[model samples]
Target: EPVNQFTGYLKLTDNVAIKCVDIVKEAQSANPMVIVNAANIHLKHGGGVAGALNKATNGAMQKESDDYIKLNGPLTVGGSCLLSGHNLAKKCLHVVGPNLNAGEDIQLLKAAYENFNSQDILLAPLLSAGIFGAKPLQSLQVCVQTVRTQVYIAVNDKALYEQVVMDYLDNL
Candidate 1:
């Protein structure tokens, strides 16, 4: 079944999606899926989506992340890594996005999207808009423009969801 609580879903393109959902549910239900994480260079599982995935996967996510860091060192801006998804999802794609200070947020965020496979189901998020300081609208615009796969963006906020839909309505 598709992920639950998709309160707002839009086909930004034939392959990409802006779908509001809980990441836990997406991981639990979106079998063979790749859940994207707006990650830190250290790959630390902090609060927000990272924390939830680590929790729902029964701590496996964080444990793997710790090992990943040890094995590969750290990911820099625009760099990404793929980790095994335990108990839920087929994989987790962690992309270290660019901070606003970099002035390359657009290119870096698009690089993250380029990591996804067009055939796989992806649980993408509003990346670069976290501590990276990117505006939500900026990130959202980049997503709509670049995704070339079946991507589902897990938006959790009601206002943002409405805003996304409204933006589409106003334009289309």
Candidate 2:
């Protein structure tokens, strides 16, 4: 079973005192699990999906990956690290949505899916909220949800994402 990890009410507008850094540190201390530092979708200011992949800090990224290998053992470590063109997760999906201007995120995603065959497929949603607005975000959500081959989304938008998930689940 896939454990869906949720970051609650993660809009930048709330301005929580402790950033996600604190959350990650605490999680690592408690369980020593694989931290897929995905592109947070709900936090609009976190540079969108592409931003998450492209802008991830090197020090933070290295530590997270290293922790997984050390605690779980290399044998336990595997999967595509979901990220956009910006992030540095080991295996990436770089889906070009509306925010970025440099590369083809769609092509990146397609290639990753078509070419790679790994059970450890870690997903990070690089949603199109920033570029396409709510409607497009909502629509894309449906498309991604129905994909038979499961991938993960780092969803911050509950309303839109839930609708898509419900659609996917209802028929199942």
Candidate 3:
């Protein structure tokens, strides 16, 4: 009875479906059992996706993030900090991936996916795609190939988002 639903291309290894949608809309709509924040090791909610998430969750995300950092020191590459999302999503998995290259980012994303303990849909932005300047197509391919769960790839533009979806489909 898990709320596992996604509309996108799937890899043969698992039921993971990758779709591109509005980040905030899908984050609010899917009500993801878990949402991963593209966080720095310091867990600061200053800018980038983390800042937007902080605003969306109304400070709860940051408060819990601080507590999480306190509990588990600094996050090493591919390391993750799981915090309560409070009013945002059920839980938030914080990770800071390496820049640009899809190789390291893919591993970082896989770690975050494995840390979650649910089959429900997970809403996430393209990990390291924003502030980290990762190529969208490469990042998309990495997530589609690496993650084996229902994932919603929240993008801002509708047309370009579809293009990216096809890009991933083509890579598969």
Candidate 4:
């Protein structure tokens, strides 16, 4: 198994820490723990984290989400659901955020983090960064503001990662 590698991190109060790291390495190789899924309300697999994770875990993620929906219903904005990540991770937490055209509800964005308790290890993307249609920088801002536990944010796009690091320096 690969070990957790760190490029850098910005530490904050309330025992919160945000770091940029390779997601696949963290999810599969190194520290297999929790990977956050930017979920659609339906909770089926979509692009980005959800799709990749689904493929990685042999559809365990989707299956759990499916079971959840069958038991409950479609997930709502700001609500979170947990699924077994199989070997990739022990757990996956799904949070549905607002779409840009659908609604730019930042409160719901912040509320997404509040719903869950602290986890020692978590891997999340820039919430609302892609499929949900949100600015990555703003999503990073929301994450730093609300996240209470240690989190490593997957930085997939180099351009966005550059900007994110710049903002991270500016904000700090």
Compare the candidates by TM-score and give the number of the best one: 1
CA lDDT scores, all candidates in order? 0.73, 0.34, 0.65, 0.70
Tens digits of lDDT, candidate 4, 1-172: 5434434555544444445555665565446477787788898786877787787777877878888899989888888877776776677788887777577686688877764454666777667777677877777677777777767677677777677667658877
Off by over 4 Å in 3: 1-14, 100-120, 158-160, 168-172
Which should have the higher lDDT, number 1 or number 4?
Answer: 1
Per-model TM against the reference: 0.83, 0.38, 0.75, 0.82
Q: What clash count goes with each model?
A: 0, 9, 0, 0
Models, CA RMSD each: 3.0, 11.5, 4.0, 2.8
lDDT of 1 by residue, 18-50 (tens): 666666765555564567877878988876667
- List the candidate numbers ranked by lDDT, top first: 1, 4, 3, 2
| Top lDDT model | 1
The candidate with the higher lDDT, 2 or 4, is 4
Native-to-model Cα distance after best TM-score fit, residue 108 in candidate 1, in Å: 2.2
lDDT of 3 by residue, 29-136 (tens): 666677778877788887778898898888878787777778877787656766786666777777676654434554565554454334345677766676576766
How far residue 144's Cα lies from its native spot in candidate 4, in Å, is: 0.5
Q: Residues 1-172, candidate 2, lDDT per residue (tens digit)?
A: 2232333322221211111233222332322122233232222224444334334454444354445446653320112343222223334432223223333243233323331223334333433345534343543434343334333344455665566455546756
lDDT of 1: 0.73
